[PDB]
């Protein structure tokens, strides 16, 4: 009945629908703790697509309905809701604790089967299990976030309501908890480890509080002015009130209103009768200006309106605007009465409130006036030059296309249906007005430039009535910047044009995710992997051909797309597919927009770790599936958190933390392997920059040649890199203020160092992806020979995740693998301090000191501690008797130019003294050589000791060992990072072994057949000269020689000179050794213990070519 | 042209091109090279198109070509005409750079 | 230039065609700032279609 | 600044440039095929005897030096017949040569 | 980067474009008479100015 259309009745058959699935089954069971009978309300997501609901209630009635069956089946079945959820379920099971006994009843395909009578028990409640249609729905995956945000919410409504959410759709490594650590996990000992093998993501929301709580919750990420939150209740006839306010420092609005536990976005008779009240209130309180407006007060006021009305009438779009006119009276009543109570009972605290919407009331009052001077200074309006508008005047017909400039502002201007299609194409960068004022807001260009376009002003000034488009489409790439740009845009639109998208206005475009190139065929668009896997198998049986690299084209970016194809496959509404956003509830999206936009990096960090990889589940929904202008409608709260985690995600790989296996960030590793695959080596001239930055830029990084210059540069400079990775030639700076020369000039090529880190990469020894085209491929991880990671450390900070592991001594760092690799059963406490011991601490390039041992312990132990460098200071006295202090060696990064003008801009200033002097007097032949003199008036310890204590001489380095973890962003102790190195290594060595196993067979299966050939060579070569076209000598070849059709091949293909006797002996001898290395090789993968040697005699073989001395001397206070 | 950008094989990537000319003939930045390019492919630009592109190329306006990692661009049949048996020794080559 | 009458009866400059190398968006500014300067009069919109 | 008589004069001048040198290259490189299509003649008709030298023959460079010596060929001719592959000495790539 | 030698008759200054050869001309010299002076910006002509 309701499987015909979902849609009217659950909304969409996606997210949306899915969702809405969770919230009918939690509505009805917090319905009993509304009515007084409930007090724990328990949620449950199962990993086979299952949620259960339990609470502790009344229970679900059991008995006879009055029409024959009983009332339980009454309402699963038949409408007036929860029989909508049984209707798109496959599975639906009830057990009901009602009347003192245990019922039991499973519903198969919505169809009851009957009310079995168990066991009695004098407790009371209900639990409902539902497995979601996957033939319905087109995802089965439930998003945890969103449904933890509305139970946190539902739990803030009801004082004596606690909620248990639990999700099973996680693996035992994976981060679930709210709040996470900036430190690593304690060392487990093998017990603890075992006895966990033989885990659950689970939150707890209690509010005794009730909204007082709520309003602390918002107010926690905003600064509360008073530190006195008013609450205040009242009953009527038929309804019942609940308010808490509390003000913050901030200039933004956050009133959340709410009708029995229901969301009331669009507002209502409840919240007018709040505003209006507030308003009365505040203004008799002053005690000779114009009135306060209801904007002026309500800005930077966090509010809770909570309305339990026996009989509720909506209204709006949405069913979440309360019509009740009764109530309307009775807030009103309410509020006036009790606003006016805590005004006089707290006047320290009513001065500040009124202040606030005083100095609100006179920034809008100057903004008009300044506004006033401005708009009447015959000029034409518009955009010109930036808006390309439609013909069409009608709104309603009307739709604007909101896109980057740089993205596709000129094919969308030429794709487009000029008649009612407009463009605006965003030249700039849109501001985070999340936590703005709307000056700040209103002095965003492009900010202002999409104001303009729609027609309907802001927030004080707005107007749906004065709306120009009545589609809004976001036009966005598929890509890091394409995603940050979604965020903007969304943050925009919810915090000052909320009624845009609560009456269906908001849009976002749906661009092809693949393009599907056949090599006769049209190419066909698919967007989604199930189109793309779909439209792959039905034209391979078509017949159709596509080449198996570079035939599935997977967009990134709009500016792929010619003006036609854009039209036909996004613009165009005979084919186009547009996403509604939607508002369900918008106290949920404060919290999500407050977290991911806000200013708690904590908050956010915490978000990101706990979604950064994607949830491990069966999506059956995504398996099985069973008009013109057409709509679907997607969350803003869903489609926040996708944008903002891919965002996040694609900062944090590609630029801020390295993968542990071997301590690259995307761009070095594609320099490296780019300068590879060219020859760079060693052992041959080097090749000028432009060559290798080129090659990286055109294959891998496609991005400016700076980017890939500044990588390049880095791993060549010997004040940079412990050990360095590029063999530079010509001037790559200084370690002050001096840069390369131009990548024109400079030559580079790669380290014998660096070879150990491409060590048989071409032997199939890690994962390859596709590269940025899908042409050809680069690898995920380099074979890292050597333990790069700790041997030259990694810096990088992006949204909220910071990096700083220090270099450190390779000698020091082979015997800590050397030990992991012989005690390779030892648990985390004993790995733990036996890699400590064998590494000593940092390592730096630019050698100086470190002081005291604590800060190196806390790093190995804990992942994050404080490490104090120190420079060398030697002290010289010239012919006259003068003093002066040479610096020899100073701290890791610190910039020598930096460090120079600091002293001098600290002495002309008089913050130090003794100092009459400072030149640079360094050079390759004479070290570092930073001459102070100093005063004949100074003592040299003295002045030494204050350049510790007041510039970078002595410097800190804030160690936080996070790096990336099989994809996920990890704080980890040093023996997790010996050991996930190791681990890496024996891959490498397994991975090698049997690809040269399978090249080693291939290669003896040709030369047998070449043996074959040369003992019968008289009618081999009489064949061939019989035969009048090459496939019939191949052919006779097959028949004659008991060979296949890759030998048959290897013959033909045989150069005259490989006849001579010297060369006919060659494949006889090369032959018989292969069966040598076969056996070997088949030794290696049948022996773990030969792999663990491998890596341990290669590893030495490395260490004593390049292993150096220690740079950094240790020493204690 | 070397690279077989031509007009019987599918468009590459503008960033191929670029890095192809930045690596081998004109080492400096990948903007000065986009630029050439662009405007070769613009039909606004040139009366006889010598690049053939595929994606956001700009408007003749103020719109910018996308980034060359999205455009795609080879030779038109015009610019084969340009290149027409450069391989039979048909002009003086001097050496690159780099020599 | 074209010319256009509309439903209101409203006349319109149609721009179909313009000399080599000048930039729409700045041909656009130039008319809107002559406009807006009082420099150039008898104009009261221009559009991009 | 020139006029546009001299704008296409020089056109054509190099116009004509292009062709001179084109027919040079091309008669250069027809001369270049064609002598060592002479050598793998010289080696189509004296089959038996080439296959012969070089199996009998030790290394490749006493096996050039006899190739040299029983066709009259030079050593660029001779290392084409060492290159040729065993495919070729079909009827039908035999007579492709030809 | 100055030189060591305080006597104008012995010391040299090395005037060069800090993009070129600032980094390799501070330390291929010889500091002790030697100093370096990179120029990190543009030079104006100063022929009508």
């Known amino acids: 009945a309701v499987r015909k259309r979902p849609g009217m009745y659950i909304g969409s058959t996606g997210e949306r629908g899915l969702h809405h699935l969770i919230w009918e089954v939690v509505d009805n069971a917090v319905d009993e703790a509304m009515a007084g009978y409930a007090t724990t309300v328990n949620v449950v997501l199962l990993e086979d697509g299952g949620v259960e609901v339990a609470d502790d209630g009344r229970g679900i009635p059991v008995a006879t309905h ?597 301590g690259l960030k995307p761009v070095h590793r594609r320099v490296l392997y780019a300068m590879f695959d060219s020859g760079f080596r060693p052992d041959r001239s080097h090749a000028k920059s432009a060559r290798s930055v080129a090659e990286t830029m055109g294959n891998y990084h496609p991005h400016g040649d700076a980017s890939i210059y500044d990588s390049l540069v880095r791993m060549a400079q010997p004040w940079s890199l412990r050990y360095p990775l590029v063999d530079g030639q010509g001037n790559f700076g200084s370690p002050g203020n001096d840069p390369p020369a131009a990548m024109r000039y400079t030559e580079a090529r790669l380290t014998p160092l660096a070879m150990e880190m491409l060590r048989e990469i071409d032997e199939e020894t890690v994962d390859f992806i596709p590269n940025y085209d899908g042409r050809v491929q680069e690898p995920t991880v380099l074979p890292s020979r050597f333990p790069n990671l700790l041997a030259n450390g990694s810096g990088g900070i992006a949204v909220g995740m910071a990096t700083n592991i220090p270099p450190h001594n390779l000698r020091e760092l082979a015997d800590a693998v050397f030990w992991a690799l012989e005690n390779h059963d030892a648990d985390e406490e004993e790995t733990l301090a036996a890699v400590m011991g064998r590494v000593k601490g940092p390592d730096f390039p630019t050698a100086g000191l470190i002081v005291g041992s604590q800060g190196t312990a806390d790093a190995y132990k804990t992942g994050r501690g404080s490490i104090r460098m120190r420079g060398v200071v030697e002290v010289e006295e010239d012919s006259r008797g003068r003093t002066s202090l040479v610096i020899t060696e100073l701290p890791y990064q610190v910039n020598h130019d930096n460090f120079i003008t600091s002293i001098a801009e600290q002495v002309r200033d008089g913050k130090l003294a003794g100092i009459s002097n400072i030149e640079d007097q360094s050079s390759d032949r004479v070290g570092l050589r930073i001459v102070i003199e100093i005063k004949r008036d100074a003592v040299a310890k003295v002045v030494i000791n204050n350049l510790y204590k007041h510039t970078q001489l002595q410097t800190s380095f804030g160690a936080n060992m996070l790096a990336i973890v099989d994809g996920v962003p990890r704080t980890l102790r040093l023996d997790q990072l010996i050991r996930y190195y190791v681990d890496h290594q024996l891959d490498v060595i397994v991975r090698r072994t049997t690809y040269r196993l399978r090249k080693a067979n291939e290669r003896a299966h040709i030369l047998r057949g070449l043996v074959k050939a040369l003992d019968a060579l008289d009618e081999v070569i009489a064949l061939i000269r019989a035969s009048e076209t090459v496939d019939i000598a191949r052919a006779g070849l097959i028949e004659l020689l008991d060979i296949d059709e890759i030998q048959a091949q290897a013959i033909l293909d045989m150069q005259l000179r490989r006849l001579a006797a010297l060369e006919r002996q060659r494949i006889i001898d090369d032959l018989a050794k292969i069966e040598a290395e076969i056996a070997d090789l088949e030794d290696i993968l049948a022996k773990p213990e030969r792999q663990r040697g491998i890596v341990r005699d290669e590893l030495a073989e490395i260490v004593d070519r390049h292993g150096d001395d220690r740079r950094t001397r240790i020493i204690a206070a």
């Not at 689970?202 to 008013?230: E, M, Q, W």
């Not at 019509?323 to 605290?349: I, M, R, Y």
């Not at 189109?531 to 034209?539: H, I, T």
């Open 66 to 662: 009055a029409s024959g069956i009983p009332t339980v089946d009454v309402v699963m079945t038949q409408l007036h809701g929860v029989s909508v959820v049984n209707a798109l379920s496959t599975r639906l099971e009830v057990e009901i604790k009602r009347d003192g006994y245990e019922w039991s009843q499973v519903y198969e395909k919505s169809e009851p089967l009957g009310l079995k009578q168990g066991a009695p028990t004098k407790k009371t409640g209900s639990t409902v299990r539902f497995w979601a249609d996957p033939a319905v729905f087109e995802t089965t995956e439930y998003d945890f976030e969103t449904v933890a945000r509305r139970l946190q919410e539902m739990a803030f409504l009801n004082k004596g309501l606690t909620i248990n959410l639990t999700d099973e759709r996680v693996t035992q490594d994976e981060v679930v908890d709210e709040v996470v650590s900036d430190v690593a996990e304690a060392p487990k000992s093998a017990s603890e480890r075992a006895a966990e093998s033989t885990k659950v993501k689970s939150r707890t929301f209690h509010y005794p509080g009730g909204l007082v709580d709520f309003v602390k919750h918002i107010n926690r990420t905003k600064n509360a002015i008073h530190s006195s939150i008013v609450d205040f209740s009242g009953k009527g006839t038929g309804h019942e009130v609940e308010i808490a306010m509390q003000w913050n420092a901030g200039y933004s609005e956050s009133v959340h209103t709410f009708a029995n536990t229901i969301n009331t976005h669009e507002g209502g008779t409840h919240e007018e009768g709040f505003r209006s009240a507030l308003t009365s209130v505040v203004n008799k309180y002053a005690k000779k200006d114009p009135n306060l407006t209801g904007d002026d007060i309500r800005e930077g006021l966090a509010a809770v309106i909570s309305v339990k009305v026996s009989e509720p009438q909506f209204e709006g779009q949405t069913k979440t605007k309360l019509g009740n006119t009764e109530v309307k009276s009775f807030v009103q009543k309410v509020c006036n009465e009790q606003l006016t109570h805590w005004f006089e009972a707290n006047p320290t605290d009513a001065k500040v409130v009124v202040n606030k919407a005083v100095s609100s009331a006179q920034a809008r009052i100057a903004a008009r006036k300044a506004r006033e001077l401005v708009r009447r200074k015959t000029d034409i309006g518009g955009l010109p030059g930036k808006l390309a508008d439609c013909r069409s005047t009608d709104p309603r017909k009307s739709e604007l296309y909101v896109v980057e400039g740089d993205s596709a502002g000129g094919s969308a201007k030429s794709g487009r249906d000029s008649m009612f299609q407009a463009i605006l194409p965003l030249r700039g960068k849109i501001i985070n007005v999340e936590k703005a004022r709307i000056d700040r807001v209103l002095k965003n260009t492009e900010v202002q430039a999409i104001i303009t376009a729609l027609g309907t002003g802001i927030h004080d000034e707005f107007d749906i009535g004065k709306l120009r488009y009545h589609k809004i489409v976001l036009m966005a790439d598929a890509d890091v910047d394409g995603q940050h740009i979604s965020t903007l845009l969304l943050t925009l639109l919810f915090r000052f044009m909320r009624p845009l998208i609560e009456n269906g206005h908001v849009f976002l475009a749906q661009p092809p995710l693949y393009k599907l190139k056949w090599q006769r065929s049209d190419p066909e668009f698919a967007y989604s992997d199930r189109e793309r896997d779909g439209l792959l198998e039905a034209g391979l049986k078509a017949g159709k051909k596509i080449n198996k690299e570079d035939g599935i084209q997977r967009y990134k970016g709009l500016g792929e797309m010619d003006a036609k194809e854009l039209w036909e496959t996004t613009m165009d509404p005979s084919v186009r597919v547009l996403r509604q956003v939607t508002l369900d509830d918008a106290a949920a999206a404060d919290e999500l927009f407050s977290i991911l936009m806000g200013e708690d990096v904590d908050a956010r960090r915490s978000f990101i770790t706990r979604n950064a990889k994607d949830v491990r589940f069966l999506d059956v929904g995504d398996l099985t599936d069973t008009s013109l202008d057409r709509i679907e409608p997607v969350d803003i709260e869903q489609e926040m958190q996708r944008s903002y985690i891919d965002y996040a995600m694609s900062v944090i790989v590609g630029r801020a933390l390295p993968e542990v296996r071997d």
